[PDB]
Amino acid sequence: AITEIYDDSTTVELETLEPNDNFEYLAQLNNVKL
């Protein structure tokens, strides 16, 4: 979540999204194995 402010006092919020949840699941499995 990154907020950017312009000259009109209007802010834009930009957040990256993760469509493939498998990356997190494999990462958590590897972390618990570690």
């Binding site: 493939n20 498998n22 990356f23 494999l26």
Partner: protein, 97 residues
Amino acid sequence: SINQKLALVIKSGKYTLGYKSTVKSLRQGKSKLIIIAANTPVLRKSELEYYAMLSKTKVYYFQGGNNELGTAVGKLFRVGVVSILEAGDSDILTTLA
């Protein structure tokens, strides 16, 4: 790492997973790099090696089996060979990997 670059290519670039798609892209000359797992059969691996030699396409030997390569791609099914048509937002081609 090397898996991060592959994941970046999957998310942003252009790619083909599987032997048939990789061979088709090599025939069309649309491939920039081919990643080959260590689990691939010797005949198909040798045919891919000969095809890459014919088409002058870079070859990288993945350090793992087909399911490790699939997980690196982010898929829950085994993939034996991957072809990178366009790196996109990643830098796998620049780093010679």
